RNA sequence: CUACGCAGUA
RNA sequence: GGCACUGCGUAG
């Protein structure tokens, strides 16, 4: 029958299915089933789970059993395999030692170890001097890695004598340096992973070494207690009075990071205040049973509950719309976007969604090649460090974060901070780590779902330093046209048409494809955020040294990845994800999206049978991909360029931080040479730990229809100046709901109303070209209502209701 | 400049205010217990805080954790000193019962002092 | 269509309830919020009327 | 080009 | 009472 094999020879290379005591299944079957996951064909996974008593037959009759979000209990079922997997690891090491004692030079593949852990194969082995034969275990461990943390194989290391029946290990409560334990863990399990492993990423050679060591530490940090991770404090004496100040940090991925300027100055006052050490040290203990998230302290005597008010209602606009025939029974245009109110327990319930974030150990060789390829998408932009006087801030009347919001807005801090002080703080962050506290506040906005949304306001120090670090690259990305990332490209004045024409650039059999990320801001693995930060920091080869770049990465990890959440008046620890109030949320999201797409393409090309490929060039590309992925250590720039050109030709992407429109060769995807929805679903399952459903993904066959939805806009082909141009229109329900329901009563009457509707009439003009009549009448409704507002309030303003003002907004003149 | 001076004074005052709230009786002991002198932040309240706040969403968790007037947590014996509801109104220990559970405004904030 | 104006009346009812300082009580505010959200997300007109009558009775209690 | 206010998008 | 981008609005 069909069995999964990891094959590499002169003809074919890849991890693919082939037609070809000893158990029925092998470890490669488990890895393939958990990596290339399709709910339509889940048989092999089902007998794997049932045979080894991970669950019962009746379990799969439950709907959405595979989904992580819908059925978190599956995290238990997979965990039942973990110990078995752990045993395999041990046996593997023994096997390696045996080969080293027999002078055997061989390559270890997943498809030669049954699920009992035994190795039943001895082919491709060549004798050498006894005591010297070296195994090759790059592909084995690299492919096995995601299953190590999907099944939680190392949980048995949390008990005394590594025995499940025995109780937990009572680690010293004051212990924070677990380096020796990390060495022991690496020595028992990954003994023959010959690349050097540094538990503390301070001692890493470059970005790739940082990624490799962090990948190991993410797995190794699950054993240790969660109270040890976080800022390391010290009791110092200033002006003759004691203080508690953080003199380091303990990252689950970067190990122990000690500051270099530990000394025991408005800049130093900010460094002290932003530190959570002083706030948590004086705070009372907290036990918040509402969430499974670890709690730190309660900064106030009473817990605070924040409620979301119901949105106001515009009787004037609704009455006008009803008088014109809108909101009629059976109409195609209805109200589906409302202001949803929430009770006092909404904020903590939203914060509880971080339980979807899990410790994910990415495939290290695949991730390294993928970051190499993703770096090609950012070779056109330029970035570097900038001085305090070159930093541009959009608005200074926003919140300055906690605890700085007790004293003033960000304008006050930017005014008090002289340019020399800002530069001194920025140079300080390159040597030391400044942990910060970020507030989460319920957001008040239109939605079509009743789930609450929160925003993570970050402190002023993190904002300032991250701006000085990243603003040059951010403004370079936002000012580039015709690239993969379309951030900063205006949809107006023919921008949508230009973007779509760029996406359709010379694809042989073009089909459009689009997807969405479930719980993107809550379920993103820490490794992918670290890799995105490293990619955004790759522009600093000439301005920052190795130590400066590493300490900047550590600062970003401490102030984004492992934040202190000031939720409802209490301090919690964020397991991971991304902060919606971060400085580089959109760009890191774009890097992560491109990473996921490239990973899907690599998986699709490697999982192809290879022998059935009719193109010599594609087969050679696949063979070189495998030998540069799991067999080549240093970066091969020639093949990276070749594969990047291959993707750019056959897989054209338009990415805005979550929204991806892909123009792909239909024939190549059909043969399996290019990623499809199934590949993205598999990648999200085994990397992002979220099940992607077919309801949130779309595919388009005819390009004249355009993308089904990009940035919540639909695309249609219309006539302008004897030219067929692509024109985007929004949901009429969204526009009508925005008109009917305003944020506060101040926007229910007055001059401001006009401006509001004008903007809406700018966004909902294209509906006039829609074949459906109600959509076309929406814009005329808005125009007539704006005319009525002009009549009520009261020749320059006469342009507001004439259609030419909005006609000009979608012509390529400007 | 005036805003800068006022904010410097305010932040110094707030740091000092947290300082006066900080008790060295257990912090010094745990600091000297460590050989390096650095301790994780997350274990400072777990070993030096005198007051504990527990938020109870449902009666099952209340019975599991702090059913009586005195319970144990973080390897320390805590004694209940106050119980309030989501309206910040005092709720007596006898008021909390399975029969009276629908009448209570959950969640319940119970404040205890170390023993 | 009665669905639309029922939804609008439910929105204004919850707004006036909030203006009546009903959000001080946890249970009453939670019930009102759940009723209003269910009304807005409902697709049955009769169910919308039933929940709106329940919310209006809650308002009429005080 | 600057200040302010609003709208849309993630 | 968060970031980034685009577009309008009144003032030079
Ligand atoms: Zn390293
Ligand atoms: Zn730099």
Author numbering:
A (entry chain A): 31 to 50, 118 to 361, 367 to 896, 910 to 929
B (entry chain B): 77 to 191
C (entry chain C): 1 to 62
Paper text:
Coronaviruses use an RNA-dependent RNA polymerase (RdRp) for the replication and transcription of their RNA genome. RdRp is an important target for the development of antiviral drugs against coronaviruses. Biochemical assays show that the RdRp uses the active form of molnupiravir, β-d-N4-hydroxycytidine (NHC) triphosphate, as a substrate instead of cytidine triphosphate or uridine triphosphate. When the RdRp uses the resulting RNA as a template, NHC directs incorporation of either G or A, leading to mutated RNA products.
